[PDB]
Structure formats: structure tokens, C-alpha cells
Design a protein around this ligand. Structure first.
Ligand SMILES: OC[C@H]1O[C@H](O[C@@H]2[C@@H](O)[C@@H](O)O[C@H](CO)[C@H]2O)[C@H](O)[C@@H](O)[C@@H]1O
Ligand SMILES: OC[C@H]1O[C@H](O[C@@H]2[C@@H](O)[C@@H](O)O[C@H](CO)[C@H]2O)[C@H](O)[C@@H](O)[C@@H]1O
Ligand SMILES: OC[C@H]1O[C@H](O[C@@H]2[C@@H](O)[C@@H](O)O[C@H](CO)[C@H]2O)[C@H](O)[C@@H](O)[C@@H]1O
Ligand SMILES: [Ca+2]
Length: 559
């Protein structure tokens, strides 16, 4: 792609190909700002009746997602036109946006939904979904326009366009018990469990209340919808932060959940509840072509192995998208798209079973990461992250590679490579933590590169980063750092075929003193065919001040 191959096309409102009579924001990297939080770090602000932005389809489309920002505590409309003819109205809302903190309390980002004295609003963008009754061809002018009766103002960030097939019917009424207006999901599952000839349940097109955790047990179960634009599982929207969805017991290992969407009612992060799917220790489960929003996470695996998450869309969550922890091995996380997660979009946390091993995180896109990293790997052995696209992180790297234990029981990285192979990272990095007494100080925070290689309190070894393009990172391309006083010696850290384009500070930073009490990096790293192009200050910082770290320039480096 790079990244996930999805049926929707993403088009930025601010593209020079798009006529507008509105106000195009100049880009910045500021959280809590309508430019800094936008995809591409820009949006088009429509602020008077008749203001519009005109997109042009590059593929046929009958369905649209508008990422936008409106005023706090408001709902309303904005209009959509095809070739100059009005065709409908998006339902735009800030119900799920606006999370409050202060510049020195970014640790609270996502947790606090109420405004207050001295508090700044963050997480300003949200989405509106709309299907039209015609497939419009590529080349159609799709205009988003603020007409009389629409919202007072709106920032238009991007438009998804998609040609959605008609809804898929029950695959076989004699094998899949249908949910219906008078038969709930739980009732259909009971009928399935008690009849050995059933393969599972079918959930038709429509909106279906999920007001509980729905338990899958008895045997492997198939849950099949009509397609994610059609089958909508809806948490009670007059409630907030209800822990609803599915919970897969061991007896239902081997289950499949596919072809549906789930619309949660979380308005802030809560730690504990809030994963759409629970499945501690689950095995052989497939989650495919589902679209989930407004949960804390899609899935947080705990010693969960041999599972497949494929073709999913994870948008606007309050913490991590998918995390696999504590022994989770041999999972296939393939061809998933995440936008707007509230912590690491796709993560692997290895802890004691010795390591999380054999996982394949492939063809993944993670953008508009509202806190933490697009991709994060904490220890492990023999895990692959391949064909990745990450962009527009608010506070942290595109890719975190860390051997910090966080106080848990872990051995760090193991004896087989953790591989990052094929990645494009656009406008990644950010500010987090504090930098009191730091070297190379530019603000009150620690400052994160597109890729952060952090030796923590556990072994940091066998890391291969290859075939990566890093475009316009906030600060740095590659950032290497060792936690003091542990000073774990980094071994077998290799970087190959990497382009670092226009970093504002340095192509590569060896962190010398992150904050008071911290020192430089230990071990070394090899660089082959690593190009640093147009750095703001210099290609590499910290080499002379890092006497315990050896930079090896194998060949092909312009620095
Ligand atoms: O009040 C519930 C939600 O209403 C809106 O979203 C609509 C949704 O409920 C479903 O019916 O689909 C339509 C069309 O895509 C949505 O517009 C609000 O936008 C959402 O904030 C509310 O929770
Ligand atoms: O293994 C660590 C814990 O993981 C889960 O809780 C997470 C919490 O520590 C924090 O990271 O936030 C996320 C998102 O809300 C939580 O999932 C488990 O729930 C917890 O039992 C573990 O100790
Ligand atoms: O020391 C306890 C904290 O460790 C981690 O955060 C570190 C932070 O405190 C600061 O020192 O910077 C380093 C990175 O340079 C951070 O890793 C944990 O993330 C945090 O939860 C702990 O409280
Ligand atoms: Ca944009």
C-alpha cells in the first residue's frame, strides 16, 4: 500500500485538487488544535452559509464518512452535493469528541469528558456516516457545503468514499438462527446452542441493541452479519460507558464474528471494562470485516493464540485498538485499518510461557493516533510487523520498540528477531512526559521520534528495521535511548533501507540526557542505506556524547 488494502478511499479536504471558498488551515503539530489534530495536519473550515469544499471521486461511491469538528455539545447537519445537486445531509455531532486535560496533564488524555476551569479541549474530531441511494462514478464532484439550517461552523478534515455492495442475506436459514425484531441476539444464540445442526446466528441489516456482554460458549459459534454498513450492533446511546459486546469462553474457541459493525457508547476511557470482544486465552477465533467505534478497545488478548483479526476497521476508540499480551502467540493481525485510537493502535506486549512469539502484524494502517503510538512492540521474540502505514500521532512515535517492563513480569526481547519490514510513517512523533534537567531541551516535554528504540529495564536485542520511509516526522526519524541506571546493552539492532525526509530537528537522535538522572545509550546499531534528507538542524545528534554506543555505518549512508 503501504498499509491496509481497504475498499474505501481517503481524500483530504485540504488537497490542492479541491476547490473551496472556505478557510484552509496552515499545518501544525499541536494537540488540542483544529489543524494539529487533523489528518494531514489540516482541514477546511466552513464558517458561512454557502461555504463548501469540493471533492472529486477517484473510485465509484454510494457511501461516505466525513471526519469533521463541530462545536462542543452540539448536533446538526452539513450538506452533500453530487455534481452540484443536493443529495442529503450528514448527521454531525460532538457527542464523542472533546476530551479535557491541560498541557502538563496529558496523562489524562481520553479519560475526562467534562469541561472545567483551566481545562483545554483535545480529541476534537469525530465522524459522520452517510449512504446515498445511488452509486456515483469516479469523477463525480462531491461537495460538502454548509447550507441554511446546517451547523454554524464545521472543520472538514477528510472524506472516506466507498462503493458498498447490497446487504448479504442469511447464508442458510436452516443453519444460522436469524436475529429478528422479536428474537434477540441472546435468544438466537440459545437456539443455536441447543440445536447441533446450527452453525451459528445471522444478524440482519438493522440496528440491534447490545446492552450486555453476550457470552459465547457451548461450542465454536459463527456470528454473521449483512456487512458492516448494514448490520449495526448498538450500545444504548442514552447511556454512557456501558461494557457491552461479546465475551468468548473457552468452549467457543474456534468461533468467527464477521460482517457487521458495533457502535459503542463510551465517551471517555475506562480501564478494565470496555473491550468490544473479551476472550481471555482464546484460541483459533476469527474476527473479520467488522467496524467498531466508541469502545475502549476492540480486543485486548491475554495468552490468546492462533487468532485471526482481518479486514477490520477500528475507529475512534478511547484506548488501544488491538493489543495482544501475556503469552499471545501465532496470531494473524492482517489488513486492518485504525483511525482515532486513544492509545497504541496495534500493540504487542510480551510478558510471562516465556515470550509472545510468532505473531504477524501485516498490512496495517493506523492514523490519527490520539495518544501513544501507531504501532508498539514491548519485548517478545520472532514477531513480524510488515507493510505498515502510520500517520499523524498526537503525542508519541509512529513505532515504539521498548524493553521497559512497566512493572510487569517480562524478559524483554528474546533471541529471535522482532522485524519491522516495509513501513511509511508520515508526521509521526510528538510530546509526552517531562524533561526537567534534560539535554537538547526545546520544551517542557520529552520529544519523540517517528521510531523510538528504548532499552528499558529488560533485554533489548534482535531488532531489525528495514524498508521504511519516514516523511516529515515531528522531530526525528530514529530515536535511540537507554534507561539509566539499568543501561541494558542493545545488541543486534539493525536499520536497512530507510529514508528520513525533512525531520524538523535530526534524522537520528541518540538521547544523551532525557531528564535529570538519565544518561546516554548503551550498545550500538548498524545502518545500511539510511538516507537523511533536509534535516532542520543536522543529520545525527548525540554521537560524540554517547561513548557507550557505537553507530556502525555499513554502507550507503549520507551522514
Ligand atoms: O443518537 C444515536 C446516534 O445518532 C447519530 O448517528 C446515527 C446512528 O444512530 C445510526 O442510525 O446511523 C446514522 C447514519 O449513519 C447515524 O447518523 C449520532 O451521530 C450519534 O452521535 C448518536 O449516538
Ligand atoms: O496486563 C496489564 C493489564 O491489562 C489490562 O488493563 C489495561 C490497563 O492497564 C491500561 O493499560 O488500560 C487498558 C485500556 O483500558 C487496559 O486494558 C487488564 O484489564 C488488566 O487486568 C491487566 O492488569
Ligand atoms: O518510572 C515510572 C514510570 O515509568 C514510565 O514512564 C517513564 C517516565 O516516568 C519518564 O521517566 O520517561 C520515561 C521515558 O523516557 C518513561 O518511560 C511509565 O510509562 C510510567 O507509567 C511509570 O510511572
Ligand atoms: Ca485533512
Amino acid at each position: 500500500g503501504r498499509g491496509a488494502n481497504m475498499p474505501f478511499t481517503i481524500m483530504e479536504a485540504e488537497s490542492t485538487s479541491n476547490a473551496t471558498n472556505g478557510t484552509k488551515l496552515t499545518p501544525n503539530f499541536k494537540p488540542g488544535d483544529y489543524a494539529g489534530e487533523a489528518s494531514g495536519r489540516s482541514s477546511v473550515y466552513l464558517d458561512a452559509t454557502g461555504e463548501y469544499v469540493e471533492f472529486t471521486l477517484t473510485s465509484p461511491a454510494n457511501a461516505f464518512v466525513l471526519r469533521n469538528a463541530v462545536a462542543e455539545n452540539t448536533t446538526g447537519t452539513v450538506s452533500i452535493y453530487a455534481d452540484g445537486v443536493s443529495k442529503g445531509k450528514f448527521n454531525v455531532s460532538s457527542k464523542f469528541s472533546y476530551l479535557y486535560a491541560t498541557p502538563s496533564t496529558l496523562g489524562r488524555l481520553g479519560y475526562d469528558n467534562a469541561p472545567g476551569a483551566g481545562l483545554t479541549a483535545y480529541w476534537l474530531y469525530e465522524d459522520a456516516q452517510l449512504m446515498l441511494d445511488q452509486v456515483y462514478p469516479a469523477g463525480t464532484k462531491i461537495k460538502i457545503q454548509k447550507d441554511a439550517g446546517d451547523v454554524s461552523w464545521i472543520y472538514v478534515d477528510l472524506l472516506e468514499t466507498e462503493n458498498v455492495a447490497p446487504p448479504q442475506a442469511n447464508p442458510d436459514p436452516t443453519k444460522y438462527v436469524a436475529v429478528s425484531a422479536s428474537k434477540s441476539i441472546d435468544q438466537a444464540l440459545t437456539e443455536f446452542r441447543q440445536d447441533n445442526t446450527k452453525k451459528g446466528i445471522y444478524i440482519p441489516a438493522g440496528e440491534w441493541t447490545i446492552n450486555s456482554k453476550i457470552f459465547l460458549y457451548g461450542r465454536a459459534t459463527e456470528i454473521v452479519g449483512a456487512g458492516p454498513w448494514y448490520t449495526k450492533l448498538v450500545a444504548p446511546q442514552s447511556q454512557s460507558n456501558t461494557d457491552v459486546g461479546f465475551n468468548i469462553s473457552a468452549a467457543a474457541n474456534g468461533s468467527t464474528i464477521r460482517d457487521l459493525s458495533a457502535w459503542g457508547n463510551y465517551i471517555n476511557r475506562v480501564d478494565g471494562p470496555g473491550k468490544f470482544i473479551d476472550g481471555n486465552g482464546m484460541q483459533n477465533v476469527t474476527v473479520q470485516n467488522i467496524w467498531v467505534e466508541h469502545f475502549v478497545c476492540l480486543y485486548w488478548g491475554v495468552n490468546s493464540s492462533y487468532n485471526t483479526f482481518k479486514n477490520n476497521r477500528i475507529k475512534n476508540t478511547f484506548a488501544a485498538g488491538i493489543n495482544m499480551t501475556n503469552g499471545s502467540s501465532y496470531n494473524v493481525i492482517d489488513n486492518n485499518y485504525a483511525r482515532g485510537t486513544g492509545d497504541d493502535s496495534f500493540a504487542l506486549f510480551s510478558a510471562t510461557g516465556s515470550y509472545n512469539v510468532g505473531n504477524k502484524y501485516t498490512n496495517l494502517t493506523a492514523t490519527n493516533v490520539r495518544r501513544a503510538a501507531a504501532f508498539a512492540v514491548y519485548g517478545g521474540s520472532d514477531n513480524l510487523f510488515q507493510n505498515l502505514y502510520g500517520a499523524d500521532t498526537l503525542t508519541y512515535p509512529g513505532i515504539t520498540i521498548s524493553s521497559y517492563s512497566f512493572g510487569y513480569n517480562t524478559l524483554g526481547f528474546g533471541d529471535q528477531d522482532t522485524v519491522i519490514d516495509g513501513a511509511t510513517l508520515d508526521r509521526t512523533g510528538g510530546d509526552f512526559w517531562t524533561s526537567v534537567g534534560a539535554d537538547d531541551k526545546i520544551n517542557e516535554y520529552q520529544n519523540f521520534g517517528a521510531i523510538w528504540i528504548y532499552g528499558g529495564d529488560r533485554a533489548i536485542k534482535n531488532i531489525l528495521i528495514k524498508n521504511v520511509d519516514i516523511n516529515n516526522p515531528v522531530y526525528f526519524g530514529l530515536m535511540f535511548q537507554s534507561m539509566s541506571p539499568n543501561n541494558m546493552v542493545m545488541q543486534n539492532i539493525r536499520v536497512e533501507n530507510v529514508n528520513i525526509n525533512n525531520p524538523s530537528r535530526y534524522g537520528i537522535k541518540l538521547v544523551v540526557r532525557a531528564e535529570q538522572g538519565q544518561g546516554p545509550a548503551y550498545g550500538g546499531a548498524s545502518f545500511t542505506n539510511v538516507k537523511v534528507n533536509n534535516p532542520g538542524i543536522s543529520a545525527i545528534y548525540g554521537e560524540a556524547q554517547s561513548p557507550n554506543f557505537t553507530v556502525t555505518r555499513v554502507s550507503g549512508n549520507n551522514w
